[model samples]
Target chain A: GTVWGALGHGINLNIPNFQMTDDIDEVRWERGSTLVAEFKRKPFLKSGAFEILANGDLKIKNLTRDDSGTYNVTVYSTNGTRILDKALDLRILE
Target chain B: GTVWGALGHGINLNIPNFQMTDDIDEVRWERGSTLVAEFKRKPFLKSGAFEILANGDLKIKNLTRDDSGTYNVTVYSTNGTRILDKALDLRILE
Candidate 1:
């Protein structure tokens, strides 16, 4: 679902039925061409304007105009299976 | 913005400010892991329940529940540049 946020306000990006199983390898989120946040179970890599919550939701603080766009997320599991790849459109209105 | 459609109805997927200049190499659309339609200036590939409109919009006929999901589109330019990569969430209501 698209999450709308006003400029300077915080927003949460929720993954429906999100659960971290041992088979889950990584969860990466990107805004346009930029990597916003990443959660890795093993061989970890993380970055961005987000805080990873215990429930696998991404909370971005202080929304800016530059943050508006389609946020793409990819969840990979073991055995080369991409469990899910979803996109969320975020429009920051003035 | 997400596009909502009803079962057995036709829908138009529009790309705002979409134009096919000489630099436009290809425009591809996919649903889930399936390729729906494609437009190419060079080598071309096309398939699925869609017709390419004059304005570069995709006209899909007979949208079923299976046709629902995120419709991903990628526009590549002649310089091997990905001009745009967008996702349109399509919810097919019964």
Candidate 2:
């Protein structure tokens, strides 16, 4: 499915059945092949424009044309086992 | 003035009486002293996080603690003359 975003708006790309909790072993968000956010005990957010929310969702605000792309997310359970993987197509409109 | 922004939210630093139009000569948005966004005929956006709105306001989304700072904006009319100069204190809250 495609997520539509207008310029200057905030958009969220949700991950399936993932929540930001201390128990989460690891989580990674990738914009294509580039890593944008990761969580391992503490959150390591790489981009100033992307945020990982408590709901296991990746978000970007002040949307622009450059933000249009496929966003992929992976999550691991408390035992460090891969639990969920999801992808979303995001489109930024003027 | 102080603008409070929550984490992962979009924030705008507004310029007084400035409207973006074809006749507008130039505009610039600075993070402290570093240039973040500039507009002549084509908009020169330096950062992936910041945006210049049609009303001549500077907007940033996915606000983080690192985003807290002083943002300054300057705009010019069609003659390349200064039209408005404004400053905003942006505070990011967890």
Candidate 3:
């Protein structure tokens, strides 16, 4: 599915059917091909851009057209199994 | 003022007593000397890192230590007067 955000407003982005859990060994957040944030023992959320919520949602505040891009998130299980791999199209309205 | 944020939590950053008003011709957001976002007729929020709300607040979600830095928001009046020159220390608690 796709989502929209209004400029100067805010939006929360997340993968479907996934929430942060103890069983998950790691989480990765990406914008286009670049890494935006990562979570292992702790989260490495860069740019202060967006935050990864407890429920595995990417929350972006003060939206702008620059936020328009393809977003990817990957989750891994502690047992060495690749779990959630999802992407979405995020469009920010001018 | 010193502002704090918790990991994977969120923080709303902003200047004191300023709102987006029609009298304002431009508003600029910065981290150090780097331009984060700019507002003229519209906002140019970059990196999707933070957002400038209607109240001139920079809202950051899912806080991370990598975001720890000085944030600057400069507001100029329609008459080209530099009205708001404000900033603060943003610290992310590990």
All models, DockQ values? 0.02, 0.03, 0.02
Candidate 3 residue-wise lDDT, A48-79, digit = tens: 67544443445555455555454554443333
C-alpha lDDT of candidate 1 relative to the true structure: 0.39
**Lowest summed lDDT over 10 consecutive residues: which window, candidate 2 chain A?**
A33-42
Task: Identify the superior model by lDDT, candidate 1 or candidate 3.
Answer: 3
| Candidate ranking (lDDT, best to worst) | 3, 2, 1
Residue A47 shift from truth in candidate 3, angstroms: 2.0
CA displacement after TM-score superposition, residue B4 of candidate 3 (Å): 30
Please write out the lDDT profile of model 3 over residues B1-94, one tens digit for every residue: 3333334343344433344444443333333333443323333344556444443445555455455455544443433354444444555444
lDDT of 2 by residue, A1-94 (tens): 2323344344343342333433333333333333343322334344566544444444465666555454544444433344444444554444
Residues B8-84, candidate 1: write the lDDT tens digits.
Answer: 33334344334334444334333345333333232211333444332223344455555445544444333334444
* CAPRI accuracy category, model 1: incorrect
Query: Candidate 1 has what TM-score?
Result: 0.27
- At residue A15, candidate 1 shows an lDDT of 39
Which portions of model 1 miss their true places by more than 4 Å?
A1-94, B1-48
- Steric clash pairs (candidate 1): none
- Candidate 3: regions farther than 4 A off: A1-41, B1-94
lDDT of 1 at A14: 40
